[PDB]
Design a protein around this ligand. Structure first.
Ligand code: NFU
Ligand code: SF4
Ligand code: SF4
Ligand code: SF4
Ligand code: SF4
Ligand code: SF4
Ligand code: SF4
Lengths: 345, 559, 345
């Protein structure tokens, strides 16, 4: 009864995988909420294993989980002991500085019966991190510290690299995987997770990351490289007020120097965006975010130099486009309802 | 018996519920709610440019951030003394309406729904499952589910037909949202003085086209949930008691009228009224205020049970409002957050969540006003006002009339939400579904107004402004989970003080100095135990159904 | 039993409307097949009145029609007998010159109930157009003559405005509504069609059109002003072979002088397009199409000029941005797990 063609069905190198999702870092749960917007692939696509041949995925995420309280945490505590040999660690939110304390906590999950003492995020990390197949950073907070690692913050928090080391490799040789963004672009994360499910199954090579440990195929090109308002930039036409359809670099957009794919990719099903729809890029996917971008609605100094640049040839190269567009908005002479044919036949 | 669950899942943020429950009498003696995350927005916001507020405050939460951005942009509008073009606030309303439609739908049928699904009911009340199979749903004609037991199975996570469907519904409602505000949850096109969204006939075409699909979906979902909730009222007579409290409801208004709103503190009384979700404190079955200035001044943040040192010896910044009124010290405008990290102890200090209360001028009481969800608080206030006349939404006094015109496959529908007589867990969840129809209804009206502005040719979307060297500002806006305020202070052209107070902060708060319980506590205390299990295997679904009714959101709660 | 909300529903000015869709032009039916792909609004959306307060729609289109043969042509014949008043005439395909014949025909649809001869496209237009509420051209063939009005074509065909006259008006005042594109972009047409349904209900002003009778809000801006490769254009980075992610003007793209929203708008649900995904723009929405654009894969003459010029400041501004991006890939110094906090608090 075993149908010919099942021979195309090859068992994954890793039969199953556990995804331990810590949302109790310093942050909102925006990256968890965001990924439920994905379609390429969707989050139910991944759990129900819509794409065959990949490891069976077990998703342990507080926001969606069926288990509750102490039973939800049970898989977390088990892995800590070394009982689990197939879990990837996902952090969402930044890592608090607990050394500046103290007899308290900035962030925590799992009150523990060991002493009736809440575990801190730093304890969880170097408890699970060195036993994991891979550690994933979900959101600019967990990757680089983000908005909460702002100048003047009380917690003195940081990203996963700050805490573990930028050269830190997992027990399976996988460097820290950083998927930045605030929040993470839905498809971006699901593309990266899917890539990891492929790599672990044996069907793909080591995930190509960059120096900041970002997925190359998502974060190499800059925002400006994919912005459709870039025409009006070349032609020296810059928006005077928000809402205008032209380039908004003088209005706050850091797009020319930020590594993000949103304008090119869209936010949800091609719909959303930032500067391509009149929202200035505030550089939310960068390590320097947000301090190296504020005040947001001010022009980037670099833009000021390049904006003020005199492109003399501008208005006449803008002329032949006009002149050429006019010859192209008129039909050839042989299109008429006259008694004789004049096409050339 | 000491039964506690921490962290509580299928909510946003890390929450913990510790309790003392009397099994022998089926009662909950005490209760104590606690968060575990502090980020300190009020702290690092100080000294920053005011123009950065809505971008930063949006990150307060990953599910309702657009509400803070909106609420923040409201306040800067006040401070900078600027009124954005009329079409810009229609656009912002269309965006926020989609935010309601998205959030309540994802939360109702994917987070709180799991509490009602087969798998849970067959782990909590194996008897109720047996009962459920033979109950035919009163509205199977509208939602195609023959029995309540079928509906329940349709909610099993990832396998349930309706579970999987609402995920889809949360995507195109977010698409809608993104058409108006750029991206979700943190907006990209929102600014003080207007928006960056380009108004075209396409923009409103792509929104209306998706809206109509959400409208028809609600014709199915309203009856679908009434039947499931009416069931528990019939299945377990008295269950109404679970998660109930005195009618202590807050509603600080929602969608706004560019015809009237100029964003001045003085005229804030007036255009406070004409908001398409009438603001007001309801207490209790009775309605006190038509005025936000009225309700604004009466807000006090208490500290009986929180990890802060209190700002007794910290300098005030605002003594009077822009209209001469007196301003309190424990009011957010004059608040100073001193974070005090310390060991947990439910005797006195056990939560990062402050204890906001309200002040009744009539009685000198500082009651723990709640939102309930808070689509429940919202609907209650508007029904009484009898002030909103939108057609799609109409207020009589005894109720509010939600009308959804004929779609492609169904005819007209009207949903009259009558005052529930009770403020319980189920009626909250019942309210959440009804407000989705409210949003869809309201959104239909805003689309009209917007298109007029567009056809008239008035397509400017931004009005220029200047940042004052000395100013104050208040933002009032109903978030998804209820009342949301943003109090801003500007000194030396910088943010001197900024405190956002979402709905959760109230609901999750502990008891004030006066010792009045935290809005969960009172609701989770008065909560009976209709459960069918004893402590040993007992997972305590009835308390969870109570906390989740409030639609908790701990990032908003501590910020 | 009438509810209060009913007062919100208003009766459309025109109670019902017929759309007579003549596909028997010198076309290929691609414009018809195309609008089935739309979703904003969808064809079945219009047919079932998803949006309230609009005229009842009876769509008479051969590709979808239930009715067959003589029953399908019935409402057509009846409208040429002046027995139908509320119908909109849509044409798809080029209009042939039947004056160089002769016995026979280049194109025919119905059959003459009397002579029993095939009815030519010009004959159909004379009988229907002056009675129509509005005349909509669907596709570049029917608007400007399109690919079939090419140099050397045996039929000597043309577009609506050519046959009926550029200042031609219906008996409702509406000018010829040209919807260019080969094929018409799915949502482009349904939006035009939807606008007309709003106007007839008296819910919106006359359809704003340009001098070429194109909807303004759709065909004002050029391909270029909405191309997410414009970024690489401004930074003078042009592809030299075809699978290359940067500007392709040197390879055939006419985007800078072609009026079309495709790259900005996507093809279907934001997914496809032309130059934005690596397919040169061949100006298929322009009166000059296709003759003024051939050969397609040769770079347009005006292109050679533009590309050379901006090779000047290209290098500098590129290195300015690369250096700035470097600074942005570095976190602030106050992110670390040291014993003492250094944030500012
Ligand atoms: N809705 C909502 Fe939030 Ni995560 C709350 N509570 C707030 O403004
Ligand atoms: S990166 Fe942004 S969305 Fe994600 S946890 Fe941080 S503030 Fe929230
Ligand atoms: S709006 Fe931003 S990304 Fe777009 S072209 Fe301008 S500076 Fe570049
Ligand atoms: S602000 Fe910039 S980096 Fe952030 S999602 Fe938008 S385009 Fe990307
Ligand atoms: S415009 Fe193009 S798609 Fe339409 S009939 Fe002509 S050749 Fe076919
Ligand atoms: S590929 Fe074409 S439309 Fe795109 S930027 Fe280049 S010349 Fe312009
Ligand atoms: S070839 Fe040019 S005009 Fe035609 S669909 Fe493509 S982008 Fe539009």
């Amino acid at each position: 009864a075993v149908p010919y063609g099942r021979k195309t069905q090859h068992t994954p190198a890793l039969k199953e995988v556990h995804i331990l999702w810590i949302t109790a870092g310093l942050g909102c749960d925006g990256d968890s909420v965001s990924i439920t917007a994905a379609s390429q692939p969707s989050v139910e696509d991944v759990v129900l294993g819509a794409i065959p041949g990949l490891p069976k995925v077990h998703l342990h995420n507080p926001v969606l989980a069926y288990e509750n309280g102490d039973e939800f945490m049970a898989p977390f505590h088990k892995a800590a002991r070394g009982e689990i040999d197939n879990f990837v660690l996902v952090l969402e939110g930044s890592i608090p500085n607990e050394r500046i304390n103290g007899e308290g906590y900035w962030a925590a999950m799992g009150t523990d019966p060991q002493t009736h003492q809440p575990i801190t995020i730093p304890e969880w990390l170097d408890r699970l991190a060195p036993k994991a197949l891979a550690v994933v950073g979900a959101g600019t907070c967990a990757t680089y510290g983000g908005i909460h690692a702002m100048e003047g913050n009380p917690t003195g928090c940081m990203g996963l690299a700050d805490y573990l080391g930028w050269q830190w490799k997992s027990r399976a040789g996988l460097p820290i995987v950083n998927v930045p963004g605030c929040p993470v672009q839905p498809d971006n994360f699901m593309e990266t997770l899917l890539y990891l499910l492929y790599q672990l199954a044996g069907l793909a090579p080591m995930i190509p990351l960059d120096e900041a440990l970002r997925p190359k195929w998502l974060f190499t090109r800059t925002v400006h490289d994919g912005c459709d308002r870039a025409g009006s930039y070349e032609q020296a036409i810059f928006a005077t007020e928000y809402g205008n359809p032209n380039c908004i670099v003088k209005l706050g957009c850091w797009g020319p120097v930020v590594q993000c794919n949103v304008p090119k990719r869209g936010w949800i099903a091609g719909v959303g965006g930032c500067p391509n729809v009149g929202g200035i890029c505030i550089g939310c996917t960068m390590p320097g975010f947000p301090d190296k971008f504020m005040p947001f609605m001010d022009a980037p100094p670099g833009a000021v130099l390049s904006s003020n640049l005199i492109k003399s040839y501008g208005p006449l190269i803008r002329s032949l486009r006009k002149l050429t567009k006019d010859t192209l908005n008129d039909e050839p002479k042989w299109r008429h309802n006259q008694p004789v044919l004049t096409t050339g036949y | 018996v000491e039964m506690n669950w921490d962290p509580i899942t299928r909510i946003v943020g890390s929450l913990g519920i510790y309790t003392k429950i009397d099994f022998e009498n089926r009662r909950v003696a005490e209760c104590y709610s606690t968060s575990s995350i502090f980020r300190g927005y009020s702290i690092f916001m100080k000294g920053k440019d005011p123009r950065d507020s809505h971008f930063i405050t949006s990150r307060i939460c990953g599910i309702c951030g657009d509400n803070h951005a909106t609420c923040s942009v409201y306040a800067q509008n006040m401070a900078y003394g600027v009124k954005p073009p009329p079409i810009a606030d229609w656009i912002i309303n269309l965006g926020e309406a989609a935010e309601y439609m998205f959030d309540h739908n994802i939360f109702q049928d994917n987070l709180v729904g799991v509490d009602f699904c087969e798998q849970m009911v067959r782990e909590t009340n194996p008897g109720v499952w047996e009962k459920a199979k033979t109950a035919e749903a009163p509205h199977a004609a509208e939602h195609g589910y023959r029995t309540i037991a079928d509906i329940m199975t349709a909610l099993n996570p990832f396998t349930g037909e309706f579970y999987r469907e609402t995920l889809l519904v949360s995507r195109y409602t977010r698409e809608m949202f993104c058409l108006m505000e750029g991206r979700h949850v943190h907006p990209s096109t929102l600014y003080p003085g207007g928006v960056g969204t380009v108004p075209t006939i396409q923009l409103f075409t792509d929104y209306i086209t998706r809206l109509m699909k959400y409208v028809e979906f609600m014709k199915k979902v309203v009856p679908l949930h009434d039947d499931l909730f009416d069931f528990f009222y019939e299945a377990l007579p008295g269950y109404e008691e679970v998660g109930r409290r005195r009618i202590l409801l807050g509603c600080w208004g929602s969608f706004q009228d560019p015809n009237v709103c100029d964003y001045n503190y003085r005229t804030m009384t007036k255009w406070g009224r004409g908001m398409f979700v009438t603001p007001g404190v309801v207490v209790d079955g009775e309605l006190l205020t038509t005025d936000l200035v009225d309700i604004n001044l009466n807000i006090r943040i208490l500290l009986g049970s929180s990890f802060y040192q209190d700002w007794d010896h910290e300098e005030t910044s605002v003594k009077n409002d822009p209209l001469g009124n007196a301003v309190d010290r424990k009011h957010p405008w004059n608040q100073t957050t001193l974070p005090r990290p310390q060991k947990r102890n439910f005797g006195g200090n056990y939560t990062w969540v402050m204890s906001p209360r309200w002040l009744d001028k009539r009685t000198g009481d500082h009651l723990a006003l709640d939102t309930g969800g808070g689509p429940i608080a919202r609907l209650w206030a508007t029904a009484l006002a009898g002030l909103v006349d939108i057609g799609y939404i109409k207020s009589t006094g005894h109720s509010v009339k939600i009308y959804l015109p004929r779609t492609a496959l169904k005819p007209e529908a009207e949903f009259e939400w009558k005052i529930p007589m009770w403020s319980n867990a189920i009626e909250r969840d019942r309210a959440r579904t009804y407000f989705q129809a409210y949003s869809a209804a309201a959104a239909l009206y805003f689309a009209e107004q917007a298109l007029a502005e567009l056809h008239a040719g008035r397509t400017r979307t931004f009005t220029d402004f200047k940042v004052p060297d000395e100013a104050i500002g208040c933002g009032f806006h109903e978030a998804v989970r209820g009342v949301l305020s943003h109090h801003l202070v500007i000194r030396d052209g910088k943010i001197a003080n900024y405190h956002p107070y979402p709905p959760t902060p109230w609901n999750a708060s502990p008891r004030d100095i006066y010792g009045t319980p935290g809005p969960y506590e009172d609701a989770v205390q008065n909560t009976p135990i209709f459960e069918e299990n004893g402590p040993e295997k007992f997972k305590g679904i009835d308390i969870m159904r109570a906390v989740r009714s409030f639609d908790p959101c701990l990032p908003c709660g501590v910020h």
